[PDB]
Protein backbone atom coordinates (compact mmCIF):
# COMPACT_ATOMS: atom_id res chain seq x y z
CA UNK A 1 0.00 0.00 0.00
CA UNK A 2 2.16 2.79 -1.35
CA UNK A 3 1.32 6.46 -1.03
CA UNK A 4 0.15 6.52 -4.69
CA UNK A 5 -2.08 3.54 -3.92
CA UNK A 6 -3.37 5.45 -0.89
CA UNK A 7 -4.38 8.38 -3.09
CA UNK A 8 -5.85 6.04 -5.70
CA UNK A 9 -8.00 4.37 -3.05
CA UNK A 10 -9.04 7.84 -1.91
CA UNK A 11 -10.20 8.72 -5.40
CA UNK A 12 -11.90 5.34 -5.80
CA UNK A 13 -13.83 5.98 -2.60
CA UNK A 14 -14.84 9.40 -3.90
CA UNK A 15 -15.92 7.91 -7.23
CA UNK A 16 -17.99 5.12 -5.70
CA UNK A 17 -19.53 7.64 -3.31
CA UNK A 18 -20.45 10.32 -5.83
CA UNK A 19 -21.72 7.74 -8.30
CA UNK A 20 -23.86 5.88 -5.78
CA UNK A 21 -25.47 8.82 -4.03
CA UNK A 22 -25.90 11.25 -6.93
CA UNK A 23 -27.20 8.50 -9.20
CA UNK A 24 -29.65 7.29 -6.57
CA UNK A 25 -30.80 10.85 -5.93
CA UNK A 26 -31.62 11.54 -9.56
CA UNK A 27 -32.90 8.04 -10.21
CA UNK A 28 -35.43 8.76 -7.50
CA UNK A 29 -36.15 12.25 -8.84
CA UNK A 30 -37.28 10.38 -11.95
CA UNK A 31 -38.69 7.03 -10.89
CA UNK A 32 -40.65 8.36 -7.93
CA UNK A 33 -42.98 10.33 -10.22
CA UNK A 34 -42.92 7.29 -12.50
CA UNK A 35 -43.76 4.99 -9.60
CA UNK A 36 -46.50 7.29 -8.34
CA UNK A 37 -47.94 7.20 -11.86
CA UNK A 38 -47.74 3.41 -12.14
CA UNK A 39 -49.57 3.27 -8.81
CA UNK A 40 -52.15 5.96 -9.51
CA UNK A 41 -53.07 4.83 -13.04
CA UNK A 42 -53.83 1.25 -12.02
CA UNK A 43 -57.34 -0.08 -12.48
CA UNK A 44 -59.16 1.39 -9.49
CA UNK A 45 -56.74 4.11 -8.38
CA UNK A 46 -57.04 7.89 -7.99
CA UNK A 47 -56.37 8.62 -11.66
CA UNK A 48 -57.13 5.22 -13.16
CA UNK A 49 -56.11 5.34 -16.83
CA UNK A 50 -55.35 2.03 -18.50
CA UNK A 51 -53.84 3.71 -21.55
CA UNK A 52 -51.45 5.78 -19.47
CA UNK A 53 -50.61 2.82 -17.23
CA UNK A 54 -49.73 0.72 -20.26
CA UNK A 55 -47.64 3.54 -21.73
CA UNK A 56 -45.65 4.21 -18.55
CA UNK A 57 -45.28 0.51 -17.77
CA UNK A 58 -44.13 -0.08 -21.34
CA UNK A 59 -41.48 2.62 -21.05
CA UNK A 60 -40.37 1.16 -17.73
CA UNK A 61 -40.12 -2.41 -19.02
CA UNK A 62 -38.40 -1.29 -22.21
CA UNK A 63 -35.68 0.53 -20.31
CA UNK A 64 -35.40 -2.42 -17.94
CA UNK A 65 -34.77 -4.77 -20.89
CA UNK A 66 -31.73 -2.90 -22.29
CA UNK A 67 -28.36 -4.29 -21.12
CA UNK A 68 -26.28 -1.85 -19.12
CA UNK A 69 -23.61 -1.55 -21.80
CA UNK A 70 -25.88 -0.94 -24.79
CA UNK A 71 -27.66 1.68 -22.70
CA UNK A 72 -24.44 3.49 -21.82
CA UNK A 73 -23.39 3.48 -25.47
CA UNK A 74 -26.69 4.76 -26.85
CA UNK A 75 -26.52 7.41 -24.11
CA UNK A 76 -23.02 8.60 -25.06
CA UNK A 77 -24.19 11.43 -27.39
CA UNK A 78 -26.93 12.67 -25.07
CA UNK A 79 -24.51 12.08 -22.19
CA UNK A 80 -22.16 14.58 -23.84
CA UNK A 81 -25.04 16.94 -24.59
CA UNK A 82 -25.66 16.92 -20.84
CA UNK A 83 -22.25 16.88 -19.13
CA UNK A 84 -20.06 17.70 -22.13
CA UNK A 85 -18.20 14.38 -22.04
CA UNK A 86 -18.80 10.65 -22.28
CA UNK A 87 -15.91 9.73 -19.96
CA UNK A 88 -15.13 10.10 -16.28
CA UNK A 89 -17.32 10.46 -13.23
CA UNK A 90 -20.36 12.47 -14.33
CA UNK A 91 -20.37 10.69 -17.68
CA UNK A 92 -20.62 7.41 -15.79
CA UNK A 93 -23.26 8.75 -13.41
CA UNK A 94 -25.67 9.75 -16.17
CA UNK A 95 -26.16 6.27 -17.68
CA UNK A 96 -26.16 4.83 -14.16
CA UNK A 97 -29.06 7.14 -13.28
CA UNK A 98 -31.06 6.18 -16.36
CA UNK A 99 -30.44 2.50 -15.64
CA UNK A 100 -31.59 2.83 -12.04
CA UNK A 101 -34.69 5.02 -12.46
CA UNK A 102 -37.07 2.27 -13.73
CA UNK A 103 -36.14 -0.14 -10.95
CA UNK A 104 -36.69 2.73 -8.51
CA UNK A 105 -40.09 3.37 -10.05
CA UNK A 106 -41.07 -0.28 -9.66
CA UNK A 107 -39.88 -0.28 -6.05
CA UNK A 108 -41.96 2.85 -5.46
CA UNK A 109 -44.98 1.19 -7.06
CA UNK A 110 -44.46 -1.76 -4.72
CA UNK A 111 -44.26 0.51 -1.68
CA UNK A 112 -47.39 2.48 -2.56
CA UNK A 113 -49.25 -0.75 -3.28
CA UNK A 114 -48.75 -1.67 0.37
CA UNK A 115 -50.69 1.46 1.40
CA UNK A 116 -54.09 0.53 2.90
CA UNK A 117 -57.25 0.92 0.88
CA UNK A 118 -59.31 2.71 3.53
CA UNK A 119 -56.85 5.60 3.54
CA UNK A 120 -57.17 6.16 -0.20
CA UNK A 121 -60.94 5.94 0.29
CA UNK A 122 -60.78 8.63 2.97
CA UNK A 123 -58.56 10.88 0.86
CA UNK A 124 -60.99 10.63 -2.05
CA UNK A 125 -64.00 11.20 0.23
CA UNK A 126 -62.56 14.40 1.69
CA UNK A 127 -62.31 15.76 -1.85
CA UNK A 128 -58.54 16.03 -2.25
CA UNK A 129 -57.01 16.54 -5.66
CA UNK A 130 -54.86 13.69 -7.01
CA UNK A 131 -51.69 15.69 -6.41
CA UNK A 132 -53.01 16.70 -3.00
CA UNK A 133 -53.50 13.02 -2.20
CA UNK A 134 -50.03 12.19 -3.48
CA UNK A 135 -48.20 14.90 -1.57
CA UNK A 136 -50.32 14.63 1.58
CA UNK A 137 -51.26 10.94 1.75
CA UNK A 138 -49.55 8.56 -0.63
CA UNK A 139 -45.99 9.66 -0.01
CA UNK A 140 -46.42 10.49 3.69
CA UNK A 141 -48.19 7.24 4.52
CA UNK A 142 -45.84 5.12 2.38
CA UNK A 143 -42.73 6.87 3.70
CA UNK A 144 -41.24 3.91 5.66
CA UNK A 145 -41.43 1.57 2.68
CA UNK A 146 -40.02 4.28 0.43
CA UNK A 147 -37.03 4.78 2.74
CA UNK A 148 -36.35 1.05 3.02
CA UNK A 149 -36.52 0.86 -0.77
CA UNK A 150 -34.01 3.69 -1.02
CA UNK A 151 -31.74 1.81 1.39
CA UNK A 152 -31.93 -1.31 -0.77
CA UNK A 153 -31.41 0.66 -3.96
CA UNK A 154 -28.29 2.50 -2.80
CA UNK A 155 -26.77 -0.71 -1.47
CA UNK A 156 -27.25 -2.10 -4.98
CA UNK A 157 -25.92 1.09 -6.56
CA UNK A 158 -22.56 0.61 -4.84
CA UNK A 159 -21.68 -2.48 -6.87
CA UNK A 160 -23.66 -1.29 -9.88
CA UNK A 161 -21.46 1.81 -10.02
CA UNK A 162 -18.41 -0.40 -9.51
CA UNK A 163 -19.41 -2.26 -12.69
CA UNK A 164 -20.56 0.63 -14.86
CA UNK A 165 -17.68 2.86 -13.81
CA UNK A 166 -15.20 1.63 -16.38
CA UNK A 167 -15.66 4.52 -18.78
CA UNK A 168 -12.80 6.15 -16.91
CA UNK A 169 -14.57 6.22 -13.51
CA UNK A 170 -14.27 2.87 -11.75
CA UNK A 171 -14.26 3.56 -8.02
CA UNK A 172 -13.41 1.04 -5.33
CA UNK A 173 -14.83 -1.92 -7.24
CA UNK A 174 -12.74 -1.18 -10.31
CA UNK A 175 -9.70 -0.76 -8.05
CA UNK A 176 -10.35 -4.13 -6.44
CA UNK A 177 -10.70 -5.76 -9.85
CA UNK A 178 -7.47 -4.21 -11.15
CA UNK A 179 -5.04 -4.07 -8.24
CA UNK A 180 -6.64 -6.37 -5.67
CA UNK A 181 -7.38 -9.17 -8.13
CA UNK A 182 -5.67 -8.62 -11.50
CA UNK A 183 -2.19 -9.08 -10.07
CA UNK A 184 -2.22 -10.67 -6.65
CA UNK A 185 -2.25 -7.84 -4.09
CA UNK A 186 -3.97 -9.22 -1.01
CA UNK A 187 -3.59 -5.99 0.96
CA UNK A 188 -5.28 -3.83 -1.67
CA UNK A 189 -8.08 -6.35 -2.15
CA UNK A 190 -8.78 -6.59 1.58
CA UNK A 191 -8.71 -2.80 1.90
CA UNK A 192 -11.25 -2.42 -0.90
CA UNK A 193 -13.50 -5.03 0.66
CA UNK A 194 -13.31 -3.44 4.11
CA UNK A 195 -14.16 -0.02 2.69
CA UNK A 196 -17.13 -1.46 0.81
CA UNK A 197 -18.37 -3.30 3.89
CA UNK A 198 -18.11 -0.12 5.94
CA UNK A 199 -20.01 1.78 3.25
CA UNK A 200 -22.89 -0.69 3.05
CA UNK A 201 -23.01 -0.84 6.84
CA UNK A 202 -23.23 2.95 7.05
CA UNK A 203 -25.98 3.10 4.45
CA UNK A 204 -28.05 0.36 6.08
CA UNK A 205 -27.59 1.90 9.53
CA UNK A 206 -28.79 5.26 8.24
CA UNK A 207 -31.75 3.65 6.48
CA UNK A 208 -32.81 1.63 9.50
CA UNK A 209 -32.44 4.60 11.86
CA UNK A 210 -34.61 6.76 9.60
CA UNK A 211 -37.17 3.96 9.22
CA UNK A 212 -37.55 3.39 12.95
CA UNK A 213 -37.81 7.16 13.36
CA UNK A 214 -41.11 6.92 11.43
CA UNK A 215 -43.79 5.25 13.55
Amino acid sequence: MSEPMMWLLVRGVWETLAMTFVSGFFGFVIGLPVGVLLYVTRPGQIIANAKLYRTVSAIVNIFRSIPFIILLVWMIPFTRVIVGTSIGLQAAIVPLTVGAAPFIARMVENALLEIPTGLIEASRAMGATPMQIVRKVLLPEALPGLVNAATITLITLVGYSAMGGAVGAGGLGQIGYQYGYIGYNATVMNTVLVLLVILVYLIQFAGDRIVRAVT
Binding site: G127, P140, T215
Partner: protein
Protein backbone atom coordinates in the same frame (compact mmCIF):
# COMPACT_ATOMS: atom_id res chain seq x y z
CA UNK B 1 -84.24 18.16 -0.43
CA UNK B 2 -80.56 18.14 0.48
CA UNK B 3 -80.33 14.44 -0.40
CA UNK B 4 -82.26 12.42 -2.99
CA UNK B 5 -81.52 8.80 -3.86
CA UNK B 6 -83.64 7.15 -6.54
CA UNK B 7 -83.85 3.53 -7.68
CA UNK B 8 -80.46 2.56 -6.26
CA UNK B 9 -79.34 -1.01 -6.99
CA UNK B 10 -75.94 -2.57 -6.36
CA UNK B 11 -74.59 -6.02 -7.19
CA UNK B 12 -71.31 -7.44 -5.94
CA UNK B 13 -69.57 -10.41 -7.56
CA UNK B 14 -67.58 -11.78 -4.63
CA UNK B 15 -66.75 -15.02 -6.41
CA UNK B 16 -68.93 -17.94 -7.46
CA UNK B 17 -72.02 -15.99 -6.40
CA UNK B 18 -73.43 -12.52 -7.03
CA UNK B 19 -75.25 -10.48 -4.38
CA UNK B 20 -77.98 -7.81 -4.51
CA UNK B 21 -76.59 -5.68 -1.70
CA UNK B 22 -79.11 -2.97 -2.62
CA UNK B 23 -82.22 -3.40 -4.77
CA UNK B 24 -84.13 -0.32 -5.97
CA UNK B 25 -83.79 1.82 -2.86
CA UNK B 26 -85.02 5.42 -2.75
CA UNK B 27 -84.68 7.92 0.09
CA UNK B 28 -85.01 11.69 0.46
CA UNK B 29 -83.55 13.81 3.26
CA UNK B 30 -84.40 17.53 3.63
CA UNK B 31 -81.91 20.20 4.65
CA UNK B 32 -81.02 20.28 8.32
CA UNK B 33 -82.81 16.99 8.93
CA UNK B 34 -81.51 14.04 10.96
CA UNK B 35 -82.16 10.61 9.53
CA UNK B 36 -81.27 7.17 10.85
CA UNK B 37 -80.66 3.85 9.12
CA UNK B 38 -81.24 0.52 10.87
CA UNK B 39 -81.48 -3.09 9.79
CA UNK B 40 -80.17 -6.60 10.32
CA UNK B 41 -76.44 -7.04 9.74
CA UNK B 42 -75.44 -7.44 6.12
CA UNK B 43 -78.57 -5.72 4.82
CA UNK B 44 -76.85 -2.98 2.80
CA UNK B 45 -76.75 -0.04 5.23
CA UNK B 46 -73.05 0.73 4.89
CA UNK B 47 -73.31 0.20 1.14
CA UNK B 48 -76.19 2.67 0.91
CA UNK B 49 -74.43 5.34 2.97
CA UNK B 50 -71.35 4.94 0.77
CA UNK B 51 -73.50 5.45 -2.33
CA UNK B 52 -74.16 9.06 -1.28
CA UNK B 53 -70.44 9.82 -1.08
CA UNK B 54 -70.21 7.68 -4.23
CA UNK B 55 -67.53 5.58 -2.57
CA UNK B 56 -69.77 2.87 -4.05
CA UNK B 57 -70.87 3.51 -7.63
CA UNK B 58 -74.42 2.16 -8.05
CA UNK B 59 -74.79 -0.08 -11.08
CA UNK B 60 -78.21 1.50 -11.77
CA UNK B 61 -79.47 4.44 -9.73
CA UNK B 62 -79.54 8.19 -9.22
CA UNK B 63 -77.77 10.27 -6.57
CA UNK B 64 -78.47 13.96 -5.91
CA UNK B 65 -76.70 16.00 -3.24
CA UNK B 66 -77.42 19.73 -3.07
CA UNK B 67 -79.29 19.57 -6.37
CA UNK B 68 -76.21 18.15 -8.12
CA UNK B 69 -76.40 14.77 -9.83
CA UNK B 70 -73.23 12.79 -9.18
CA UNK B 71 -73.46 9.62 -11.29
CA UNK B 72 -72.89 11.93 -14.27
CA UNK B 73 -70.15 14.25 -13.03
CA UNK B 74 -66.47 14.71 -13.80
CA UNK B 75 -63.85 13.48 -11.35
CA UNK B 76 -62.80 17.08 -10.72
CA UNK B 77 -66.35 18.36 -10.24
CA UNK B 78 -66.94 15.29 -8.08
CA UNK B 79 -63.90 16.13 -5.94
CA UNK B 80 -65.07 19.72 -5.52
CA UNK B 81 -68.54 18.51 -4.50
CA UNK B 82 -67.16 15.94 -2.04
CA UNK B 83 -65.39 18.75 -0.24
CA UNK B 84 -68.95 19.54 0.95
CA UNK B 85 -69.65 16.15 2.58
CA UNK B 86 -68.16 14.77 5.79
CA UNK B 87 -67.97 11.05 6.44
CA UNK B 88 -67.26 9.02 9.56
CA UNK B 89 -66.15 5.47 8.81
CA UNK B 90 -66.87 2.52 11.06
CA UNK B 91 -63.07 2.19 11.51
CA UNK B 92 -61.94 5.86 11.34
CA UNK B 93 -59.28 5.46 8.61
CA UNK B 94 -56.88 7.87 10.36
CA UNK B 95 -53.43 8.75 9.02
CA UNK B 96 -50.67 7.28 11.17
CA UNK B 97 -48.23 9.83 9.73
CA UNK B 98 -50.13 12.72 11.32
CA UNK B 99 -51.04 13.52 14.90
CA UNK B 100 -54.56 14.22 16.09
CA UNK B 101 -54.10 17.84 15.09
CA UNK B 102 -52.71 16.91 11.68
CA UNK B 103 -55.51 14.53 10.78
CA UNK B 104 -58.07 17.13 11.81
CA UNK B 105 -56.25 19.90 9.93
CA UNK B 106 -56.00 17.90 6.70
CA UNK B 107 -59.38 18.91 5.18
CA UNK B 108 -58.68 22.54 6.01
CA UNK B 109 -55.32 22.17 4.27
CA UNK B 110 -57.17 20.88 1.21
CA UNK B 111 -58.88 24.28 1.00
CA UNK B 112 -55.48 25.98 1.43
CA UNK B 113 -57.03 27.73 4.43
CA UNK B 114 -54.73 30.06 6.40
CA UNK B 115 -52.39 28.46 8.90
CA UNK B 116 -53.69 30.55 11.81
CA UNK B 117 -57.27 29.70 10.89
CA UNK B 118 -56.32 26.03 10.85
CA UNK B 119 -54.80 26.29 14.32
CA UNK B 120 -57.84 28.07 15.76
CA UNK B 121 -60.49 25.87 14.16
CA UNK B 122 -58.69 22.58 14.86
CA UNK B 123 -58.14 23.59 18.48
CA UNK B 124 -61.80 24.51 18.81
CA UNK B 125 -62.86 21.14 17.43
CA UNK B 126 -60.47 19.21 19.68
CA UNK B 127 -61.75 21.07 22.73
CA UNK B 128 -65.30 20.25 21.65
CA UNK B 129 -64.52 16.53 21.37
CA UNK B 130 -62.60 16.78 24.63
CA UNK B 131 -59.34 15.90 22.86
CA UNK B 132 -57.82 19.28 23.69
CA UNK B 133 -54.91 17.63 25.50
CA UNK B 134 -54.27 14.95 22.83
CA UNK B 135 -53.70 17.19 19.80
CA UNK B 136 -50.07 16.19 19.21
CA UNK B 137 -50.22 12.42 19.81
CA UNK B 138 -50.48 9.76 17.13
CA UNK B 139 -53.39 7.40 16.44
CA UNK B 140 -51.17 4.45 17.37
CA UNK B 141 -51.15 5.84 20.94
CA UNK B 142 -54.91 6.37 21.23
CA UNK B 143 -57.75 4.34 22.66
CA UNK B 144 -60.63 3.47 20.37
CA UNK B 145 -62.97 6.18 21.61
CA UNK B 146 -60.23 8.78 21.22
CA UNK B 147 -59.64 7.80 17.59
CA UNK B 148 -63.38 7.83 16.94
CA UNK B 149 -63.56 11.38 18.25
CA UNK B 150 -60.56 12.28 16.08
CA UNK B 151 -62.49 11.02 13.08
CA UNK B 152 -65.56 13.00 14.13
CA UNK B 153 -63.58 16.22 14.45
CA UNK B 154 -62.03 15.71 11.03
CA UNK B 155 -65.46 15.07 9.51
CA UNK B 156 -66.65 18.39 10.92
CA UNK B 157 -63.44 20.28 10.07
CA UNK B 158 -64.65 21.72 6.76
CA UNK B 159 -68.12 22.72 8.02
CA UNK B 160 -69.82 20.44 5.46
CA UNK B 161 -73.50 20.62 4.57
CA UNK B 162 -73.97 16.85 4.96
CA UNK B 163 -72.72 14.24 7.42
CA UNK B 164 -72.60 10.48 6.84
CA UNK B 165 -72.13 8.54 10.09
CA UNK B 166 -71.32 4.81 10.06
CA UNK B 167 -71.86 3.99 13.74
CA UNK B 168 -69.95 7.10 14.81
CA UNK B 169 -70.64 6.66 18.55
CA UNK B 170 -70.21 2.89 18.92
CA UNK B 171 -66.82 3.17 20.68
CA UNK B 172 -67.93 5.93 23.07
CA UNK B 173 -69.14 5.47 26.65
CA UNK B 174 -72.63 6.79 27.47
CA UNK B 175 -71.37 10.15 28.74
CA UNK B 176 -69.07 10.86 25.81
CA UNK B 177 -71.84 9.60 23.55
CA UNK B 178 -74.32 12.12 24.94
CA UNK B 179 -71.83 14.98 24.69
CA UNK B 180 -71.18 14.16 21.03
CA UNK B 181 -74.84 13.83 20.12
CA UNK B 182 -75.66 17.10 21.89
CA UNK B 183 -72.98 18.72 19.76
CA UNK B 184 -74.46 17.29 16.56
CA UNK B 185 -77.93 18.51 17.50
CA UNK B 186 -76.58 21.98 18.26
CA UNK B 187 -74.86 22.11 14.88
CA UNK B 188 -77.91 20.76 13.07
CA UNK B 189 -80.17 23.42 14.57
CA UNK B 190 -77.59 26.24 14.33
CA UNK B 191 -76.13 25.75 10.84
CA UNK B 192 -78.93 23.54 9.48
CA UNK B 193 -76.69 20.51 9.04
CA UNK B 194 -78.22 17.48 7.34
CA UNK B 195 -77.28 14.11 8.82
CA UNK B 196 -77.65 10.51 7.69
CA UNK B 197 -76.41 7.88 10.12
CA UNK B 198 -76.20 4.11 10.58
CA UNK B 199 -76.65 2.62 14.04
CA UNK B 200 -77.50 -0.55 15.90
CA UNK B 201 -78.28 1.45 19.05
CA UNK B 202 -81.95 2.25 18.67
CA UNK B 203 -81.21 4.45 21.68
CA UNK B 204 -79.33 6.83 19.37
CA UNK B 205 -82.07 6.63 16.76
CA UNK B 206 -84.81 7.82 19.08
CA UNK B 207 -82.31 10.19 20.68
CA UNK B 208 -81.71 12.49 17.71
CA UNK B 209 -83.07 11.05 14.44
CA UNK B 210 -85.92 13.09 13.00
CA UNK B 211 -86.84 10.28 10.62
CA UNK B 212 -85.78 6.65 10.41
CA UNK B 213 -85.32 4.06 7.68
CA UNK B 214 -85.23 0.27 7.94
CA UNK B 215 -83.44 -2.10 5.57
CA UNK B 216 -83.80 -5.82 4.94
CA UNK B 217 -82.04 -7.80 2.21
CA UNK B 218 -80.96 -4.74 0.29
CA UNK B 219 -84.49 -3.32 0.31
CA UNK B 220 -85.83 -0.24 2.10
CA UNK B 221 -88.63 -1.85 4.07
CA UNK B 222 -89.98 1.41 5.47
CA UNK B 223 -89.12 4.98 6.39
CA UNK B 224 -91.12 7.11 8.81
CA UNK B 225 -90.81 9.23 11.91
CA UNK B 226 -89.01 7.58 14.82
CA UNK B 227 -92.29 6.96 16.62
CA UNK B 228 -94.26 5.72 13.61
CA UNK B 229 -91.53 3.17 12.91
CA UNK B 230 -91.16 2.07 16.52
CA UNK B 231 -94.94 2.42 16.95
CA UNK B 232 -97.38 0.32 14.90
CA UNK B 233 -94.88 -0.30 12.09
CA UNK B 234 -96.09 -2.00 8.94
CA UNK B 235 -94.53 -4.71 6.77
CA UNK B 236 -94.25 -7.96 8.79
CA UNK B 237 -90.51 -7.83 8.14
CA UNK B 238 -90.28 -4.35 9.65
CA UNK B 239 -92.45 -5.08 12.66
CA UNK B 240 -90.54 -8.31 13.19
CA UNK B 241 -87.30 -6.34 13.26
CA UNK B 242 -88.79 -3.77 15.63
CA UNK B 243 -89.94 -6.58 17.90
CA UNK B 244 -86.32 -7.69 17.80
CA UNK B 245 -85.36 -4.25 19.14
CA UNK B 246 -87.72 -4.72 22.10
CA UNK B 247 -86.41 -6.23 25.31
CA UNK B 248 -88.95 -8.85 26.45
CA UNK B 249 -86.62 -9.93 29.21
CA UNK B 250 -88.68 -12.14 31.56
CA UNK B 251 -85.88 -12.28 34.16
CA UNK B 252 -84.79 -15.84 34.88
CA UNK B 253 -86.21 -15.39 38.39
CA UNK B 254 -89.75 -15.06 37.03
CA UNK B 255 -89.15 -17.75 34.40
CA UNK B 256 -88.36 -20.19 37.20
CA UNK B 257 -91.46 -19.27 39.22
CA UNK B 258 -93.84 -18.92 36.26
CA UNK B 259 -96.93 -21.14 36.11
CA UNK B 260 -99.04 -21.47 32.97
CA UNK B 261 -102.06 -22.24 35.18
CA UNK B 262 -103.77 -19.80 37.55
CA UNK B 263 -103.82 -21.04 41.12
CA UNK B 264 -105.52 -19.64 44.18
CA UNK B 265 -104.05 -16.33 45.31
CA UNK B 266 -102.14 -16.12 42.05
CA UNK B 267 -100.71 -12.86 40.74
CA UNK B 268 -100.92 -12.55 36.94
CA UNK B 269 -97.72 -11.54 35.16
CA UNK B 270 -98.37 -9.48 32.06
CA UNK B 271 -96.49 -7.76 29.25
CA UNK B 272 -97.93 -4.47 27.99
CA UNK B 273 -97.20 -2.71 24.70
CA UNK B 274 -98.03 0.97 24.10
CA UNK B 275 -98.28 1.93 20.41
CA UNK B 276 -99.00 5.62 19.93
CA UNK B 277 -101.03 6.18 23.10
CA UNK B 278 -102.13 9.50 24.60
CA UNK B 279 -99.40 10.59 27.02
CA UNK B 280 -101.77 12.70 29.11
CA UNK B 281 -104.13 9.73 29.41
CA UNK B 282 -103.43 8.21 32.84
CA UNK B 283 -104.30 4.55 32.39
CA UNK B 284 -102.53 2.59 35.12
CA UNK B 285 -103.10 5.21 37.79
CA UNK B 286 -106.70 5.22 36.60
CA UNK B 287 -106.80 1.41 36.58
CA UNK B 288 -105.49 1.27 40.14
CA UNK B 289 -108.09 3.79 41.27
CA UNK B 290 -110.90 1.95 39.45
CA UNK B 291 -110.39 -1.79 39.98
CA UNK B 292 -108.23 -1.61 43.13
CA UNK B 293 -105.61 -3.66 41.30
CA UNK B 294 -101.89 -3.06 41.72
CA UNK B 295 -99.62 -2.82 38.69
CA UNK B 296 -96.04 -3.36 39.85
CA UNK B 297 -93.67 -2.29 37.08
CA UNK B 298 -91.07 -5.05 36.76
CA UNK B 299 -89.37 -3.52 33.72
CA UNK B 300 -90.14 -0.63 31.41
CA UNK B 301 -89.02 0.74 28.06
CA UNK B 302 -91.09 3.87 27.36
CA UNK B 303 -90.17 6.64 24.92
CA UNK B 304 -92.01 9.79 23.86
CA UNK B 305 -92.22 11.30 20.39
CA UNK B 306 -94.69 13.40 18.44
CA UNK B 307 -97.06 13.78 21.37
CA UNK B 308 -97.34 10.03 22.08
CA UNK B 309 -95.72 7.44 24.35
CA UNK B 310 -94.71 3.98 23.13
CA UNK B 311 -92.78 0.93 24.33
CA UNK B 312 -93.10 -2.23 26.39
CA UNK B 313 -93.68 -2.67 30.12
CA UNK B 314 -93.39 -5.88 32.16
CA UNK B 315 -95.67 -5.78 35.20
CA UNK B 316 -97.54 -7.72 37.86
CA UNK B 317 -101.32 -7.34 38.08
CA UNK B 318 -102.09 -7.62 41.79
CA UNK B 319 -105.50 -8.34 43.27
CA UNK B 320 -108.22 -10.91 42.66
CA UNK B 321 -108.07 -12.99 39.49
CA UNK B 322 -111.42 -11.46 38.51
CA UNK B 323 -110.25 -7.91 39.23
CA UNK B 324 -107.05 -8.63 37.32
CA UNK B 325 -108.93 -9.86 34.26
CA UNK B 326 -111.33 -6.90 34.36
CA UNK B 327 -108.43 -4.45 34.54
CA UNK B 328 -106.80 -6.27 31.62
CA UNK B 329 -110.04 -5.94 29.66
CA UNK B 330 -110.22 -2.18 30.28
CA UNK B 331 -106.57 -1.63 29.36
CA UNK B 332 -107.14 -3.53 26.11
CA UNK B 333 -110.22 -1.36 25.51
CA UNK B 334 -107.89 1.64 25.53
CA UNK B 335 -105.57 0.18 22.86
CA UNK B 336 -102.88 -1.24 25.16
CA UNK B 337 -101.70 -4.54 23.70
CA UNK B 338 -101.74 -6.87 26.72
CA UNK B 339 -100.42 -10.44 26.84
CA UNK B 340 -100.63 -12.50 30.02
CA UNK B 341 -97.51 -14.65 30.31
CA UNK B 342 -98.42 -16.74 33.34
CA UNK B 343 -99.21 -16.61 37.04
CA UNK B 344 -96.66 -15.97 39.79
Amino acid sequence: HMIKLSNITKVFHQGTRTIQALNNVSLHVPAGQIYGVIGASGAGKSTLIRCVNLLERPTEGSVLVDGQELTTLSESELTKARRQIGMIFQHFNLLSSRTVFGNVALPLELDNTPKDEVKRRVTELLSLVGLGDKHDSYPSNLSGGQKQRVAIARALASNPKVLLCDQATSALDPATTRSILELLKDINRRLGLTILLITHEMDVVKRICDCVAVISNGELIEQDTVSEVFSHPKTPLAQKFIQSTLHLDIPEDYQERLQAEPFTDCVPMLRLEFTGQSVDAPLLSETARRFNVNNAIISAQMDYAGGVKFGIMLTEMHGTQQDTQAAIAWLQEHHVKVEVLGYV
